[PDB]
Amino acid sequence: DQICIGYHANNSTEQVDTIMEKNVTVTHAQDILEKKHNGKLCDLDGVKPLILRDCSVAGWLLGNPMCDEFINVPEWSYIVEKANPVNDLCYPGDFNDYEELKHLLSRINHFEKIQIIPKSSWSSHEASLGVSSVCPYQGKSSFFRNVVWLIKKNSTYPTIKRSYNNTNQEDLLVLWGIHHPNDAAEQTKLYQNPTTYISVGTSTLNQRLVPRIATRSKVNGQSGRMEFFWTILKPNDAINFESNGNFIAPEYAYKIVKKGDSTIMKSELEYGNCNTKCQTPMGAINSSMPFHNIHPLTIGECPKYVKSNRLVLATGLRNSP
Amino acid sequence: DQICIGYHANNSTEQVDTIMEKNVTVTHAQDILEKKHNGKLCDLDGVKPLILRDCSVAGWLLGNPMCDEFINVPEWSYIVEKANPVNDLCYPGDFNDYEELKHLLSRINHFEKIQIIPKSSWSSHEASLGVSSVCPYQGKSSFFRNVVWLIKKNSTYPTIKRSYNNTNQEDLLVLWGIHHPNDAAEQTKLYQNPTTYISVGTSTLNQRLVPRIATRSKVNGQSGRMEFFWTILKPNDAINFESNGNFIAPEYAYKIVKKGDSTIMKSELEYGNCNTKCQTPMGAINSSMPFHNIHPLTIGECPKYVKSNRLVLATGLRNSP
Amino acid sequence: DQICIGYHANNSTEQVDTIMEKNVTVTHAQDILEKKHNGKLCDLDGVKPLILRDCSVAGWLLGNPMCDEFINVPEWSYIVEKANPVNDLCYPGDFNDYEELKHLLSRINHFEKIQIIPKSSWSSHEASLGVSSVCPYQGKSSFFRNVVWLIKKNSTYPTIKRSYNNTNQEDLLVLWGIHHPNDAAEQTKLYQNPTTYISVGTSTLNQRLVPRIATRSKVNGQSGRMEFFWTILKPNDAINFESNGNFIAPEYAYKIVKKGDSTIMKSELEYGNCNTKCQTPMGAINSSMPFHNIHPLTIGECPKYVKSNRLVLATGLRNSP
Amino acid sequence: GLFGAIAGFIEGGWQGMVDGWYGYHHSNEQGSGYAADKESTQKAIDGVTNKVNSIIDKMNTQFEAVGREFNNLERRIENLNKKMEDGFLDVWTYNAELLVLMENERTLDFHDSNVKNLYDKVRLQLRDNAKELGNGCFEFYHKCDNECMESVRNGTYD
Amino acid sequence: GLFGAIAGFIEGGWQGMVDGWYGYHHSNEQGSGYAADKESTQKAIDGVTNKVNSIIDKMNTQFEAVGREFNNLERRIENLNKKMEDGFLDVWTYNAELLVLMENERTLDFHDSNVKNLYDKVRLQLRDNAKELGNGCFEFYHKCDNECMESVRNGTYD
Amino acid sequence: GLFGAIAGFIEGGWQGMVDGWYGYHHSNEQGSGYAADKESTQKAIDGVTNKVNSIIDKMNTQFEAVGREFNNLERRIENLNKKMEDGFLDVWTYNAELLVLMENERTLDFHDSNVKNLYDKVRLQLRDNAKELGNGCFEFYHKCDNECMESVRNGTYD
Ligand SMILES: *[C@@H]1O[C@H](CO)[C@@H](O)[C@H](O)[C@H]1NC(C)=O
Ligand SMILES: *[C@@H]1O[C@H](CO)[C@@H](O)[C@H](O)[C@H]1NC(C)=O
Ligand SMILES: *[C@@H]1O[C@H](CO)[C@@H](O)[C@H](O)[C@H]1NC(C)=O
Ligand SMILES: *[C@@H]1O[C@H](CO)[C@@H](O)[C@H](O)[C@H]1NC(C)=O
Ligand SMILES: *[C@@H]1O[C@H](CO)[C@@H](O)[C@H](O)[C@H]1NC(C)=O
Ligand SMILES: *[C@@H]1O[C@H](CO)[C@@H](O)[C@H](O)[C@H]1NC(C)=O
């Protein structure tokens, strides 16, 4: 007669690492690293992302005519942008403080587009002629839909003095521009006046832009250059425009209705018709693991990102042959 | 007859956590996290802070007339500034490279204010008239005490050519400004000349400021704008001023006598009449704990900040019922 | 008759630390921290560094006449620069975006210098006279060898309109400058025209430089100022220069042949005639230790830097007296 | 393992003990079988469950990357931003991999310890009344039926 | 605990031993009482004192936050600065919380170990001359007065 | 140490055992000497070798400093860059110093454990047939020549 003390073995094949020994087979284990995703872009808690497709954030906000899908966009959860969007800045140029603007957007979920200066508000200047073939809409010469390229009327550019007051509770993103012609002839041709300026004033902004007229490389068959500026107009503040030519003028501006947690994620993926609690640029995650190794840049209720290939905890004991 | 081996218990109620078990009662323990502070701003090793109160660093250095408490300040240990100081920049404007200046200050303990260009040094221009009602002193129109708002004399603004040499051993902080009027009439009214410039030269600085004259929102009943610039004038170097109007000119400058470890801390607290070895924005710390969880931004002989609510080491053994 | 269980002792003096006890003598140990270096600058895998000596990166690229050792330099592995190089910018000035340029260099191993605009290409302007005594070569007034200080010919400065196309596959670093005279007389003297501009155009660059003419301190007996600009000209793009004076013009530009991992290290050391797999600013490292405590900034197959004085692992057991 | 029981003096585990993590095998005239020791098994289950929860909790405040853009002439700050984000992800990856490695070893040893403590508990009861076999087993000197056997298991004997 | 003595085979501690951390209780014709074992107590005191000092020292070089300001159009760098300062404070908070957690468990086990080692030291002396009771106690076969009792305590017996 | 054997019940090591880390000393009519126990020594060698390799590997992805320059009016970002690079070098220095400290203690205890397990293996064989001396030694009751001695060493006895 005999009594013995002993411990459990089973048919487990599960392995864990230690400091002194790799691949110990254990009776029980708990994997804590999520290695799988669904490979799609999905809604975040019901709320669909803004998927730009072939349009850049610049192309969207300025209203590139190739970006009409985004004339009026609903509240989003995050924004998706391709690494190199083709439809950006159809007329060549720069977008001043572009990355600081993008940064504001990562903390915004909704815009509401409102008209601030009506196109049929210009009596002394030609609005309807500021169009290029580099910005085509339906086979015809067109232009950024939210700004108005003002040209001389009956060979005259009177000094513009226009002003907008913010009678919205909300903050308002205002965008304008300046055209840099490539020679003295073009300046005469479009604006009449040789020496011009655009001056912008708010309670915190003291701007005076002057056209830089020089010969430069053609970009998409164009030597001219557009340079776009922006400001956030506080509620109850007024923006004061004054220019005698080269002025690309506000028509539409954006009301910042909702501030929400958001990002601009870089992804070549298109919409996947799914819902998720956790989105990466490569696919969505559904799991109750503490960690995952999909991608660092997530949004939602997400596991923590590690660079591991494997994270497995022992729970049971060393399993015997 | 019997002998037994055993261990200590006592009436301890002290608890420690482990990986496998929370709240183990131990016979002895050592708490290592300081959770308490005295809630006051105090001197640091005898040396009183510079407590700005309602004045901002700009308001102090330019000498806003509401900031007279700080005409001549003794060596400090750190500086305290409120989150939103009311007395800053009484005449609306900007302070150029303001944060890079603030950054220099965090490595400075003492200024000594010296006169570089005397107000009664201007023969060809009116000094005593450059004053606004937005900068009041004792019910009267006044102005930043350290800079001189020069105006035309007998309807003339001769070109200014003034120069200062640094015959101090020390580095010297020099401050100047430019006025941006809101129309052509004001330019004529104050400076006579339509088209002006301020030009500043040192051995490393090549500056030319030009007034940006545009219509903009009233701020504290003012449409004009002041824009202040600064440089650190090395010992034995000379600053060369040259202007034909809009020049806000140096009267006083600051000698940088002492470089010491310091910070500008943000705090709404006022002076507490205490001494301490360790100051946080919320109160001072006196302890021999290795850690504390008061606030990250301390100055002095301080424990290390952690975000914990509780850090307790076991020393004794598991205490029995 | 007796059998005993026991363990090894030896004459080891090797000591390791633990949490509860410092300086435990162990029978065997493994030191894992490299504390030694050879104190020289060496080649990295056969490939010699670019050792600037008394020349700064600016002095090298602009071709300061004191930097002739570097007219044509072979592919390097890293670059070495002293903390305060004496031969930098012989004619006083600034180098615009200098640190962003230095940053490009840390990812470049080879330049090939090519002539873009020939000095004997200027028919209407005097090239051979733009020289200063502050930039001497062999006792005579000289100048940066890679840029041409253009002066008026027969009392005239015609508008320059010159353009370069990149018919190299490679990226090309292009450098130019502008001269800021110290008075109206010098402007007349050198360039004839009172009011000048330099305008630079590529497909992405829209530049217009204007001379800032003011009185300022002498630096190395000079009141004038040079300000140098740069761009990376993409292959198949053209740079468009246009100026009517103050133009310091490209003669030579750099072809970026090879992109390699590199750094600009700061070191007062000169060449040591050695080879190594791992270089620090203080000396080279040859070891199979995992860690070292020499200096943080290494290049090559290097151990990881820690701030420790001592890292020793126990392997054997506690050694007895 | 540190405590010498698991895959040490007790050569291997028991497929036939499906019941719990540690227990007894008995063998006498009436028959033989396995019985899990539920107290030490449950104690083991609680410890490992808290460890997993402690590990998960302690890691709920790791670094989260934020998307952040820079233009062509902000390369120094872009790189700074890169090396900063990667730097933290490396610190946390190391933190997580090592915590798992060290704790995995602690867990294996804990099981060993529990087996040894249970072995010793039985050894201290039996004393002289049985031959300690050297292999996890005790051979009784006087016949020990099921109720005697149950008696060792619950901690009453003699 | 790992070593099976504290709140294991020795069921509970002694309120009546005020004297040190580990020791003996004895009981005979002349009376009974407690005596701390000073060597192992002091050894225990040194280890724990060095651990605390090691822990404090190793942490004296944590990250210190520096105040740092940014204007309205430097939001990317302000945020970078924020996430950098918070990132380190999180790394150090985790470092500190875990070091305490892991070391607390090591300390408890160390005490257990010391109790077991002291138990075994006495067991190895007594050998046959006493019945090992199973509970931390040894019942002597031949009468053992105070000097005999003192004899076990100092490590001389028989 | 935790397991009570090294510099505990076995008072000191053996200069005369050049052969391995743990083993036996025997002593009888024919003579006396040392014999390393190769199985547990090799087991010990493998564990420590893997630990060193694990430690080295886990650390191969530490933070690398990059040279980075800033002009006179970029002092905020220069300082940010400084405190960021130093911050990581401090995290890694602490990581490395503590890993070594904690693991050094684990290694010492592992050796102790191995010595105790080997002691117990022999104790479980000898049983009654020898007096346990209290010092790492077993004194035999019936004469034990070299082949009997070899018999304890390989794990066959009686
Ligand atoms: C064990 O493994 C075998 C084969 O993989 C499988 O049939 C069985 O379901 C597993 N679990 C049990 C209870 O044996
Ligand atoms: C451990 O097992 C895995 C199988 O998944 C194998 O790839 C790996 O090489 C093994 N490692 C060692 C060191 O045995
Ligand atoms: C223990 O606790 C009791 C009640 O809290 C208290 O009276 C006593 O002073 C404490 N210390 C001692 C020595 O008992
Ligand atoms: C531990 O005890 C504290 C009392 O301070 C209590 O708040 C906490 O919930 C307890 N934690 C657990 C898990 O028992
Ligand atoms: C041990 O130390 C002594 C003296 O340092 C030395 O002679 C010997 O070579 C070392 N190694 C051995 C095998 O004793
Ligand atoms: C450990 O020994 C070293 C000798 O290298 C000595 O400098 C140090 O002070 C000692 N530390 C302690 C605490 O004993």
Residues B77 and B109 sit within 8 Å (Cβ to Cβ) = yes
User: In the structure encoding, which two tokens stand for residue E18, read together?
Assistant: 């005020």
Contacts of E89 (CB under 8 A, 6+ apart): B296, B305, B306, B307, E63, E65
Q: Are residues B298 and B189 in the same domain?
A: no
Q: What is the CATH number of the domain that holds C21?
A: 2.10.77.10
Verify whether ligand 4 is closer than 6 Å to residue B309 (CB atom). no
3-class SS of residue D100: helix
Q: Supply the DSSP symbol for C234.
A: P
Q: Are residues A29 and A81 in the same domain?
A: no
Q: Is D77 on the interface with F (CB under 8 A)?
A: yes
- CA dihedral of residues B199, B200, B205, B207 (deg, nearest 10): -30
Q: Are residues B280 and B244 in the same domain?
A: no
State the DSSP H helix or E strand holding residue A6, giving kind and residue range, or none if neither.
strand A2-7
Please give the angle made by the CA atoms of B183, B184 and B187, to the nearest 5 degrees: 95
Question: Which residue, judged by its Cα, is nearest atom 4 of ligand 6?
Answer: C23
Reported resolution, Å:
2.7
Matching residue, tokens 């269980």? C5
Give the pairing type, strands A50-51 and A79-81.
Answer: parallel
Interface contact flag, F75 B104, Cβ < 8 Å = yes
Q: Are residues B288 and B154 in the same domain?
A: no
What order of strands is seen across the sheet that includes strand B50-51?
B50-51, B79-81, B264-266
Q: Are residues C254 and C291 in the same domain?
A: no
User: In the structure encoding, which two tokens stand for residue C35, read together?
Assistant: 């504390």
A224 strand-pairing partners: none
What order of strands is seen across the sheet that includes strand E32-36?
E32-36, E22-27, B2-7, E137-140, E130-132
B34 strand-pairing partners: B292
* Burial of E143: CB neighbours in 10 Å, binned 0-12, 13-18, 19+: exposed
Q: Is C212 on the interface with B (CB under 8 A)?
A: yes
Determine the Cα–Cα distance for residues D16 and D31; give it in Å rounded to an integer. 15
Q: What are phi and psi of C153, to 5 degrees?
A: -115, 130
How many Å lie between the centroid of ligand 2 and the Cα of residue A23? Answer: 6
Q: Are residues C156 and C232 in the same domain?
A: yes
- CA dihedral of residues D122, D124, D128, D132 (deg, nearest 10): 50
* Burial of C213: CB neighbours in 10 Å, binned 0-12, 13-18, 19+: buried
Q: Is A202 on the interface with B (CB under 8 A)?
A: yes
User: In the structure encoding, which two tokens stand for residue B274, read together?
Assistant: 């205490």
Mutate-to-test residue for ligand 6 from C13, C23, C311, C312, highest number of ligand atoms within 8 A of CB:
C23
Q: Are residues C58 and C111 in the same domain?
A: yes
Determine the Cα–Cα distance for residues C90 and C145; give it in Å rounded to an integer. 12
Residue of B nearest to E50 (CA): B315
Determine the Cα–Cα distance for residues B109 and B106; give it in Å rounded to an integer. 8
Q: Measuring CA to CA, how many Å separate C177 from each of C161, C208, E64?
A: 16, 12, 43
Helices (H) and strands (E) in chain E, counts: 3, 4
| Nearest by Cα to B314 from B25, B117, B4, B13 | B25
Determine the Cα–Cα distance for residues A51 and A58; give it in Å rounded to an integer. 14
Other C-beta atoms closer than 10 Å to the C-beta of A168 total 16
Residues B289 and B33 sit within 8 Å (Cβ to Cβ) = yes
Determine the Cα–Cα distance for residues C148 and C126; give it in Å rounded to an integer. 10
Query: b/e string for C50-83 if b means 16 or more Cβ within 10 A?
Result: bbbebbbbbbbbbbbbbbeebeebeebbbbbbbe
Contacts of F29 (CB under 8 A, 6+ apart): C1, F143, F145
Matching residue, tokens 């530049």? C207
* H, E, C per residue of chain B: CEEEEEEECCCCCCEECCCCCCCEEECCEEECEECCCCCCEEEECCECCEECCCECHHHHHCCCHHHHHHCCCCCCCCEEECCCCCECCCCCEEECCHHHHHHHHCCCCEEEEEECCCHHHCCCEECCCCCEEEEEECCEEECCCCEEECEECCCCCCCEEEEEECCCCCEEEEEEEEEECCCHHHHHHHHCCCCCCEEEECCCCEEEECCCCCCCCCECCECCEEEEEEEEECCCCEEEEEECCCEEEECEEEEEEECCCCCEEECCCCEEEEEECEEECCEECCCCCCEECCCCCCEECCCEECCCCCCEEECCCECCC
Contacts of A51 (CB under 8 A, 6+ apart): A41, A79, A80, A270, A271
Q: What are phi and psi of A76, to 5 degrees?
A: -115, 175
The total number of residues shown for chain D amounts to: 158
| Nearest by Cα to D65 from D91, D85, D93 | D85
State the DSSP H helix or E strand holding residue C142, giving kind and residue range, or none if neither.
strand C140-142
User: In the structure encoding, which two tokens stand for residue D74, read together?
Assistant: 């902000």
Helix axes A98-105, E75-126, angle to 10 degrees: 60
Q: How far is CA E65 from the centre of its chain?
A: 35
Residues A72 and A78 sit within 8 Å (Cβ to Cβ) = no
DSSP state letters, E11-38: ---BTT--S-SEEEEEE-SS-EEEEE-H
* Burial of B58: CB neighbours in 10 Å, binned 0-12, 13-18, 19+: buried
Residues F67 and C99 sit within 8 Å (Cβ to Cβ) = no
* Burial of B126: CB neighbours in 10 Å, binned 0-12, 13-18, 19+: middle
Q: Smallest CA–CA separation between C206 and chain D, in Å?
A: 14
Alpha-carbon Rg for chain A in angstroms: 28
Residues A178 and A225 sit within 8 Å (Cβ to Cβ) = no
Q: Smallest CA–CA separation between C245 and chain A, in Å?
A: 15
DSSP state letters, C148-177: EE-EESSS--PPEEEEEE--SSSEEEEEEE
* Burial of A3: CB neighbours in 10 Å, binned 0-12, 13-18, 19+: buried
Q: Where are the beta strands (DSSP E) in chain E?
A: 22-27, 32-36, 130-132, 137-140
Matching residue, tokens 């895959």? D7
Alpha-carbon Rg for chain B in angstroms: 28
Interface contact flag, A205 B216, Cβ < 8 Å = yes
Interface contact flag, F101 E54, Cβ < 8 Å = yes
| Nearest by Cα to C174 from C115, C258, C119 | C115
3-class SS of residue E157: coil
Q: Smallest CA–CA separation between E69 and chain F, in Å?
A: 8
Determine the Cα–Cα distance for residues D132 and C41; give it in Å rounded to an integer. 70
Q: What are phi and psi of C55, to 5 degrees?
A: -105, 140
Question: Which residue, judged by its Cα, is nearest atom 5 of ligand 6?
Answer: C23
Q: Measuring CA to CA, how many Å separate B157 from each of B194, B199, B243, C262, D111?
A: 11, 15, 9, 57, 93
Q: Smallest CA–CA separation between B301 and chain F, in Å?
A: 19
Q: Which amino acid is at A147?
A: V
Residues C284 and C38 sit within 8 Å (Cβ to Cβ) = yes
The total number of residues shown for chain E amounts to: 158
Residues B105 and B52 sit within 8 Å (Cβ to Cβ) = no
Residues C231 and C196 sit within 8 Å (Cβ to Cβ) = no
Determine the Cα–Cα distance for residues E107 and B216; give it in Å rounded to an integer. 70
Residues A202 and A269 sit within 8 Å (Cβ to Cβ) = no
DSSP state letters, F93-148: HHHHHHHHHHHHHHHHHHHHHHHHHHHHHHHHHHGGGEEE-SSSEEEESS---HHH
B151 strand-pairing partners: B126
User: In the structure encoding, which two tokens stand for residue C7, read together?
Assistant: 């363990």
End-to-end CA distance of chain F: 33
Q: Which amino acid is at C206?
A: N
Interface contact flag, E98 D59, Cβ < 8 Å = no
Q: Are residues C186 and C230 in the same domain?
A: yes
Determine the Cα–Cα distance for residues F40 and F42; give it in Å rounded to an integer. 5
Q: So what's the architecture of D1-158 in CATH?
A: Alpha-Beta Complex (3.90)
Determine the Cα–Cα distance for residues D147 and D149; give it in Å rounded to an integer. 5
Q: Measuring CA to CA, how many Å separate D125 from each of B6, D38, D119, D120, E24?
A: 19, 19, 10, 9, 22
Q: Supply the DSSP symbol for C72.
A: S
* CA dihedral sign of residues B211, B217, B221, B226: negative
Give all chains having 3 or more CB-to-CB distances under 8 Å with chain D. A, B, C, E, F
Determine the Cα–Cα distance for residues B121 and E66; give it in Å rounded to an integer. 43
| Nearest by Cα to A136 from A90, A190, A94, A68 | A90
Determine the Cα–Cα distance for residues E66 and B172; give it in Å rounded to an integer. 25
Q: Are residues A214 and A95 in the same domain?
A: yes
- CA dihedral of residues A109, A111, A112, A116 (deg, nearest 10): 160
Determine the Cα–Cα distance for residues D106 and F50; give it in Å rounded to an integer. 16
Q: How far is CA B231 from the centre of its chain?
A: 16
User: In the structure encoding, which two tokens stand for residue A167, read together?
Assistant: 């009678």
User: In the structure encoding, which two tokens stand for residue A152, read together?
Assistant: 């001389």
E18 strand-pairing partners: none
Give the pairing type, strands A50-51 and A278-280.
Answer: unpaired
Q: Which amino acid is at E143?
A: K
End-to-end CA distance of chain C: 27
Matching residue, tokens 């040079």? C226
Alpha-carbon Rg for chain E in angstroms: 26
Determine the Cα–Cα distance for residues D29 and D144; give it in Å rounded to an integer. 9
Range of the domain at B52: 48-269
Determine the Cα–Cα distance for residues B42 and B284; give it in Å rounded to an integer. 7
How many Å lie between the centroid of ligand 6 and the Cα of residue C19? Answer: 14
| Nearest by Cα to C262 from C47, C39, C41 | C47
Domains identified in chain B, total number: 2
Determine the Cα–Cα distance for residues C210 and A212; give it in Å rounded to an integer. 11
Q: Measuring CA to CA, how many Å separate C55 from each of A163, C114, C269, F68?
A: 55, 21, 14, 19
Q: Supply the DSSP symbol for A158.
A: P
Q: Which amino acid is at F105?
A: E
What is the widest separation between alpha-carbon atoms in chain C?
119
Mutate-to-test residue for ligand 2 from A18, A19, A20, A22, highest number of ligand atoms within 8 A of CB:
A22
Determine the Cα–Cα distance for residues A111 and C299; give it in Å rounded to an integer. 49
Q: Are residues A118 and A249 in the same domain?
A: yes
Residues B34 and B290 sit within 8 Å (Cβ to Cβ) = no
Matching residue, tokens 């692992």? C313
| Nearest by Cα to E64 from F97, B32, B302, F93 | B302
Domain termination residue (choose one: B248, B269, B290): B269
Contacts of B84 (CB under 8 A, 6+ apart): none
3-class SS of residue C12: coil
| Nearest by Cα to C77 from C119, C31, C109 | C109
Matching residue, tokens 């019936």? F142
Matching residue, tokens 């200046």? B101
**Ligand lying closest to the C-alpha of residue C24:** 6
Other C-beta atoms closer than 10 Å to the C-beta of C155 total 7
Give the pairing type, strands B79-81 and B50-51.
Answer: parallel
Structure determined by:
X-ray
Residues C180 and C224 sit within 8 Å (Cβ to Cβ) = yes
Q: Are residues A108 and A219 in the same domain?
A: yes
* CA dihedral sign of residues B238, B239, B243, B247: negative
* CA dihedral sign of residues A75, A78, A82, A88: positive
Question: Which residue, judged by its Cα, is nearest atom 8 of ligand 4?
Answer: B23
Q: What is the CATH number of the domain that holds A91?
A: 3.90.209.20
| Nearest by Cα to E130 from E101, E96, E158 | E158
| Nearest by Cα to B251 from B150, B148, B149, B167 | B148
Other C-beta atoms closer than 10 Å to the C-beta of C235 total 12
| Nearest by Cα to B25 from B14, B36, B41, B35 | B14
Matching residue, tokens 């975000």? B307
3-class SS of residue C115: strand
Q: What are phi and psi of D45, to 5 degrees?
A: -60, -50
Other C-beta atoms closer than 10 Å to the C-beta of C266 total 14
